[PDB]
Design a protein around this ligand. Structure first.
Ligand code: SF4
Ligand code: SF4
Ligand code: FES
Ligand code: FES
Ligand SMILES: [Fe+2]
Ligand SMILES: [Fe+2]
Lengths: 635, 635
């Protein structure tokens, strides 16, 4: 098998050869077994919203042409998309809610393993929300902030403040005029599920406006999740680490944190340091915590924990034979890990009541007992390391250097070395003079349909040569880090002269003797909210709305319902938004036209659906350059 | 075409012949055009929860055997079912929320068309919730009740009170021990959507326990909806009216209220009386308001408005040519009505922001302007009546007599004529002595897959001959009313001797000179909560839990996601629950076994999946008789 048709990651290719030798089925094998996939589902022309279904509609030809209840193709496609947006929002609802409850418990004395680590961020959030700080104890300000977070999940006398207080007033006014501001996060999720149920909303424009509103409930949960995680665990600052399977160490207890929530992984990191002698008594050098997916990004950004792998290739970390434990909370975990564990020795451990996998070991993890729960979990890992005394392992000797930790606060601080009292101005100056053509955010998943990382790297290379400032989160950041895009040594090879000049000027002012890295890692998927904060701050400084800025987004290999919600709120806040896999919309030309064209007249953003990455890069550059022209700039 | 293969309703058959002559496509034609339907969807073996899909699994044979991410058949089936339960709960969330906001506005002086009509019910609800009434103004008690209703949608320091205060403590304890009490209505909906999204919950038992909990959030919304509608519009008492298409009148302005919420239909009823002279000036005898679906049930139960038709046959009311307006809010409205209106003359009017249909006229309906909005709507209806001056219409001369209005309060009052201070005892006495074998609730929809009404009438006939007390709601009540099961003149033909003796004794004590009807109509689908209140009161009076009572439920022709949620909470509160159409579970034997067997060990209820109605009746009788035996009674 030509493994570069499956992944462009050479460590993943090596593990794919090992999996094939050993007869271990992978995600790529399960994909091949699924082909050809159902074209009704691929196009969006299938509905199972009642027990008269399944209903399908032929994309072309003869009957069936309409659902049994009379639902048209437009209605069926829009309802399916809306449910995907609601499901993404629900994942960020649970994540943010988790952190809100943890902060509340911490300041009520009920969870002593947690505390206010970033007091400055706590006070700035309180100020943004309108919560008074003068004369108040930190623990009382934090209680108020946690209560406000919980209140945004339901209707109240204000709209969702993690929308209205984080976008410029001009953008809030545009959205309010179209009825798009969410009333409550879980309120919107429930209204979507209602209006898309049988015999309810059946007008594509009305349905899609509901979808835009629910996508802003997802943005709110992301921004809430970042705000709360920064309070509890610290705002990221620049860090240096490594990525790819070579960060595993045959002689250590290798423990992957995988899933999403730092409430769990951050404690694993600190406890693992305390249990080092306990690990050495078992014959290991220590506990080697490594990251997979977003929770790996969280501990990479805050602590420099090296990233082992991401998304589609997560099983490969197990195939090395050296992964002693995989510690899970929720989201983006292939349930195949539980069965592969049987073959690879790995102990897969779930920790959250609503996210169990048959055949995994479950260790309930309560914030009230976090340290005790973490020691129980890590002792299972040490037990597993001892069982592989004497077995060979195959860890590919492949890793990259990763400079990361570029929270919005960190970026503003780095820029402030060039202009202390007007930190955004050096960035804007270089946009205006052409040294920075625009900004592109790469975000979202890998997807087995796309050779892993190929779209992220192909599009990133073309944009960097054209002097685009590239930022990245989630498994987009994972794709770019595993291919060297976060190593400043690659600036000369990857970047246009103008962008290199800017990256070098900023880095030298930060005492680096070298540039910032080619791509700025802004964190996890909830940390797409950080990109929003940066873009909104640039909008505010310029006095224009986000739909006038030369800023675009690319979910180049999207997979999860969260990525659909992300793409939709990127459009709703005003960005040209590329998606590099087909969402289930092509069976309705009216819906496609709304999402790629007429929504421009509502929010100023729009989707760019393009599966060829070189063409996608051209289209993203055209969108950036159209925004430049609209500001009167050369391009 | 043999129209009795489509519907057992003879008025519907006549309209099917008219539709065929005129070339108007119906729901049955769209069903035929859909056959054969997709077997992956029929069995539940399809997943579209991420953009790597669609994934399918062959029920038998070779690959594909597992989803791309590793999701097994058990996980895929359970996740799809859970989303259907969440969607049903969301429909009842929106309905109940609507009423809560209306009550709040009414007592805040913001909606003068609405008021506290049932002060006794207001005070009993407040007492059940723990809200003090002594020394308080009604408007303040009502504000507190509305605030408590809204609070149950989100997490707080108590669980959902419209669950914990409406079931016996012993049942609440059983549910709490299994972690099944909902924390908040919209909270549970969002948690379902999260845990069923890609890479989250992947254990069938864990997923299904989440589904049971979310089904109790649906029960809460139903019970909240009934409680609030009774406060605002009056608790039903016995009423006499008629049903079927013959209630339309060629010489009147015929206006159907269709959908769910009495906030709209109840005002239509009162305003239509005030506009009678305005209608006579246009040449009509008056405005003839008729009911379709649940909102028709609501105004039938409270005002005796005749029911025109239900569920699957709703288009047929338009085919008569005499339907001048169809006034819609949300749920169970076939969107085909908007296109059929073009051919039939009918003015289809939507009124709710989240439920529009392309091609219908939209008239926003604000509770603050209810009377003004209703007059605008009814004036469109009068305009339409005038346009059919001189056209022939074909109204089948087919109707039945319907005695209805059996709220739980009404049933208790009727029984109190036999035992004033212990009203449930005469019912229990007749259960014990065999005159009443048990109780069966028929509920839920019609479904185009089943000849309309055939399962409801076939099963009801067999149970009535075996002396089962039969109660009904929703389109189950609609099916039974359109076939004469709500006419006391049919008691001798339909009922066993024991049941006839009881129905006659109760009716004679109520001054009727005749029995109660063969089937007691307990109202709309939210009014399945009334059946809960009756059964819980019987449990309390006997000192046993609901899973010991000889009470069963039958969703004999289920369709909507709401009906899946209903069947699941009937199981969760302890009832043997028949479903007469295949839910998408047969592709997983483990899930089927949980839902039909091992859940007995958790909640004491269980599903009975049986598509043959004579066999279903036997199985329901066996379940009733097993409960009789468990109480030591003859059967
Ligand atoms: S909602 Fe309409 S289109 Fe969807 S399954 Fe039911 S009948 Fe078919
Ligand atoms: S969640 Fe798993 S099973 Fe479902 S579509 Fe995605 S890959 Fe397939
Ligand atoms: S027909 Fe294949 S996704 Fe439904
Ligand atoms: S394959 Fe037909 S419902 Fe998906
Ligand atoms: Fe993620
Ligand atoms: Fe209904």
């Amino acid at each position: 098998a030509r493994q570069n048709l499956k992944s462009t990651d050479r460590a993943v290719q090596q593990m794919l050869d090992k999996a094939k030798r050993e007869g271990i089925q992978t995600v790529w094998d399960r994909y091949e077994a699924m082909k050809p996939q159902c074209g009704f589902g691929e196009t969006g022309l299938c509905c199972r919203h009642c027990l008269q279904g399944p209903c399908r509609i032929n994309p072309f030809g003869d009957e069936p042409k309409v659902g049994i209840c009379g639902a048209t193709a437009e209605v069926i496609v829009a309802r399916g998309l809306d449910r995907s947006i609601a499901a993404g929002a629900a994942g960020h609802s649970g994540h943010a809610k988790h952190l809100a409850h943890t902060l509340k418990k911490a300041v009520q004395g009920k969870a002593a393993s947690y505390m206010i680590k970033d007091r400055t961020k706590l006070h700035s959030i309180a100020k943004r929300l309108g919560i008074p700080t003068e004369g108040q104890k930190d623990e009382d300000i934090a209680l108020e902030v946690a209560k406000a977070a919980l209140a945004d999940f339901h209707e109240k006398d204000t709209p969702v403040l993690w929308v209205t207080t984080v976008l410029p007033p001009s953008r809030v006014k545009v959205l309010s005029a179209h009825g798009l501001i969410p009333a409550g996060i879980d309120h919107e999720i429930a209204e979507i599920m209602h209006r898309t149920s049988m015999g309810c909303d059946a007008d594509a424009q009305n349905l899609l406006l509901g979808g835009l509103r629910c996508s802003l409930a997802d943005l709110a949960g992301c921004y809430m999740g970042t705000d709360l995680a920064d309070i509890l665990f610290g705002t990221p600052a620049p860090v240096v680490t490594e990525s790819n399977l070579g960060v595993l160490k045959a002689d250590a207890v290798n423990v992957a944190v995988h899933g999403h929530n730092p409430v769990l992984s951050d404690i694993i990191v600190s406890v693992s340091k305390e249990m080092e002698n306990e690990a050495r008594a078992a014959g290991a050098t220590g506990i080697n915590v490594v990251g997979i997916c977003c929770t790996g990004n969280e501990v990479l950004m805050r602590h420099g924990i090296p990233a082992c792998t991401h998304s589609v290739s997560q099983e490969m970390a197990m195939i090395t034979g050296a992964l002693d434990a995989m510690i899970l909370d929720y989201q983006c975990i292939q349930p195949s890990v539980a069965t592969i564990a049987e073959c690879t020795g790995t102990t897969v451990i779930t920790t959250m009541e609503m996210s169990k996998i048959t055949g995994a070991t479950h260790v309930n993890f309560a914030e009230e007992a976090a340290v005790e729960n973490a020691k129980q979990i890590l002792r299972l890992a040490i037990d597993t390391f001892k069982r592989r005394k004497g077995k060979p392992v195959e860890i590919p000797n492949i890793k990259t250097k990763v400079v990361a930790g570029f929270s919005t606060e960190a970026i503003i601080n780095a820029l402030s070395k060039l202009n202390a009292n007007d930190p955004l101005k050096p960035l804007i100056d270089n946009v205006v003079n052409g040294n920075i053509r625009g900004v592109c955010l790469f975000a979202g998943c890998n997807n087995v349909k796309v050779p892993q990382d190929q779209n992220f790297t192909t599009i990133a290379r073309k944009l960097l040569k054209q002097n685009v400032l590239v930022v990245a989160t989630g498994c987009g950041a994972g794709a770019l880090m595993r291919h060297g895009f976060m190593d400043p040594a690659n600036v000369d090879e990857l970047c246009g002269d103008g962008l290199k000049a800017v990256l070098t000027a900023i880095g030298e002012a930060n005492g680096l003797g070298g540039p910032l890295p080619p791509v700025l890692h802004m964190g996890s998927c909830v940390d797409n909210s950080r990109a929003v904060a940066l873009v909104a701050a640039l909008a505010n400084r310029l006095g224009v709305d986000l739909d006038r800025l030369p800023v675009v987004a690319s979910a180049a290999e999207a997979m999860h319902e969260k990525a659909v919600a992300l793409g939709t709120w990127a459009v709703t806040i005003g960005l040209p938004t590329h998606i590099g896999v087909l969402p289930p919309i092509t069976g309705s030309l009216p819906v496609t036209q709304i999402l790629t064209s007429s929504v421009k007249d509502i929010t100023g953003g729009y989707f760019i659906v393009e599966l060829d990455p070189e063409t996608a890069a051209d289209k993203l550059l055209a969108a950036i350059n159209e925004r430049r022209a609209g500001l009167g700039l050369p391009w």
